[PDB]
Amino acid sequence: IPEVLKNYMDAQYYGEIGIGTPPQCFTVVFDTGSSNLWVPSIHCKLLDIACWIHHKYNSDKSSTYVKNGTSFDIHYGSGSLSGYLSQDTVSVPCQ
């Protein structure tokens, strides 16, 4: 299943969830065709529009967070989506 056919620009099924304690809110796309959860990180590589408007995860501010660090990088169709794995408590919804 190629990421070209994926909405993500006008996905119809999204909502808010939370990561960390206190929960940090993020609006994500509920996607029945994939099986991973990922959010922007405060440690964004570039200060672009993506890092500007999006909400980013900050583990420094989370009593439940557990380090992992396994770095990842899949070539999400068009480009490459990279970051690292991390453990924490997810809340649905957030607020």
Place this chain on the structure above:
Amino acid sequence: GGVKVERQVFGEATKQPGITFIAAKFDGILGMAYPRISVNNVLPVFDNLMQQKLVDQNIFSFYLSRDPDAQPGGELMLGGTDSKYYKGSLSYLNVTRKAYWQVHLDQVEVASGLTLCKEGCEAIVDTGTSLMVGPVDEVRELQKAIGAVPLIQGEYMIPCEKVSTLPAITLKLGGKGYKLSPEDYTLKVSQAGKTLCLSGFMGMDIPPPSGPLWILGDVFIGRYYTVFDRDNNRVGFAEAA
């Protein structure tokens, strides 16, 4: 305040796609398919949520409240189905391959007199894709019957005015037949004060062994209350109320 899935591993993206690919509105993706297609074997949220026994029944549902000015993004319910979301009853289909939420399509029939997936086929329910995707040689014919116009680069345009007259397409699932009207399968765009009407079908070949697959996007799901059930491994549809 709702539920709290403890010990969930997830991804912090230090480099992600542009605003041209993922809109300013969405921060990330929360996949809900089986672990088999999970990047780096990372146990999905709902699974963990299942193991931790956080909900009465391992199922969830999407209601595209797309009626007046409700909450955009539809309404997801984790734990069970809710009468209010549908009319009548739900009909289920057993999941064929526990990777995507894949099931068996019986046949697609176009009002005109065309029939695709004639001897049945495979189809995955995908709330993340919009377009209805199908085998190109197969969908090329559909694009034809509905009178779509292939442009160079790929878009099969449809005159905005002619939309209302396009043939309804009906997918046959579990022996039952779900309808799609042009208004429903014809994606429209609007730019600088002008609208562009184009086909909602996608001719794209999914390389096996996962493919050949027909991907049932929101052009279909927005129409029917959809329930994904992990306890029993089935997917049910009911007329969205």
